[PDB]
Amino acid sequence: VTCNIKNGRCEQFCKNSADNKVVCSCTEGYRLAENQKSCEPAVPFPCGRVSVSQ
C-alpha cells in the first residue's frame, strides 16, 4: 500500500505515512470521508464538480 500504486486508493491526493500506510487528502472545499479514501463536499458548491443535471 503506497501512493505509487493506484494513488494509495485515495480519490484525490495521497501521502505516504508510517508503517506502510498512506494518508489521503482532498482539495479545498472537500472533507476526507469515513472510508479514509473518498472526498466529500464540505461546502455548497465545491470546486470542479458538475451539479446541474446532465
Binding site: 480519490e11 484525490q12 472526498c39 455548497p44 470546486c47
Partner: protein, 235 residues
C-alpha cells in the same frame, strides 16, 4: 474549438468568457468568487474587459449569466510581451464584485504543483470555449468542448517553426479536425479525477486550427500553482 460538441448548460461551470471591443475574444476559468485565471496575451493592452460567468449561448439571455468588471490585472511576473507574447502566458483578473457561486458558476480545482503535473500525465484533458469552430471561421454561439490527448514533446517541436519551452505542452490529434482555435485562448484545459475537475493547462495559442500535423499549445499550470494560490487567496 474545431471538431468539438455543444456543452450542456452547467457542464463547465468554471468557464468564463472575456468580452471587449469584440465578444468572446478569450476565455478564462474561475479560481474563486473574486478571481479569474486566463492567458496574459488576452489582457496585455488593458481595454475595458467584461467577464461573464454562467454563460452558455453568447447570443441569448439565459438567466444564469453573471457579468463582472475587472479592477486589477496581474500577469505573471516573468511575462514580457516585448520579448514573447506567448511565454509565461498566464494572468489573473480581480473582479469588481464577487461572483455568486452556484451550479452554473463554480470554481475549477487547483492541486499543488506535484499533483497538477501528475494529472497532466493522465494524458487526456477537456478544453472548452467560444472560439472559432473552423480555422478562420465563425465563433461558436453555444459553448464548445473537446477531449484532447497529450502529444509528446518531440512531435510537438517538429510540428511548428516556433519555439516551445518546458512550461508549455502540446495536445491534439495527429489526423487534424479537432483542436482549440482563436477565441479559446485563456480558457481551461482540465483533467477529470474521479468526477472532480482540476486545472492542468491554460489554452495559449495555435496556428492553422485543426490542420493535420498541427497541435494546440498550452501553458502548463503546474509551474504557476503556488503563484495562483498566493495571489488569489481570500482567507
Amino acid at each position: 474549438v474545431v471538431g468539438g460538441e455543444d456543452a450542456k448548460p452547467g457542464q463547465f461551470p468554471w468557464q468564463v468568457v472575456l468580452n471587449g471591443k469584440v465578444d468572446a475574444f478569450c476565455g478564462g476559468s474561475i479560481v474563486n468568487e473574486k478571481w479569474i485565471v486566463t492567458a496574459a496575451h488576452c489582457v496585455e493592452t488593458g481595454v475595458k474587459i467584461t467577464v461573464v460567468a454562467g454563460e452558455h449561448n453568447i447570443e441569448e439571455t439565459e438567466h444564469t449569466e453573471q457579468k463582472r468588471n475587472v479592477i486589477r490585472i496581474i500577469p505573471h511576473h516573468n511575462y514580457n510581451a516585448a520579448i514573447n507574447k506567448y511565454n509565461h502566458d498566464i494572468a489573473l483578473l480581480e473582479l469588481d464584485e464577487p461572483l455568486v457561486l452556484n451550479s452554473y458558476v463554480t470554481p475549477i480545482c487547483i492541486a499543488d504543483k506535484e499533483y497538477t503535473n501528475i494529472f497532466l500525465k493522465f494524458g487526456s484533458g477537456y478544453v472548452s470555449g467560444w472560439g472559432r469552430v473552423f480555422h478562420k471561421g465563425a465563433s461558436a454561439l453555444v459553448l464548445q468542448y473537446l477531449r484532447v490527448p497529450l502529444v509528446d514533446r518531440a512531435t510537438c517541436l517538429r510540428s511548428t517553426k516556433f519555439t516551445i519551452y518546458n512550461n508549455m505542452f502540446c495536445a491534439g490529434f495527429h489526423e487534424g479536425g479537432r483542436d482549440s482555435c482563436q477565441g479559446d485562448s485563456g480558457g481551461p484545459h482540465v483533467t477529470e479525477v474521479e468526477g472532480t475537475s482540476f486545472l492542468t493547462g491554460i489554452i495559449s495559442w495555435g496556428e492553422e486550427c485543426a490542420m493535420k500535423g498541427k497541435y494546440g499549445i498550452y501553458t502548463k499550470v503546474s509551474r504557476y500553482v503556488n503563484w495562483i494560490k498566493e495571489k488569489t487567496k481570500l482567507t
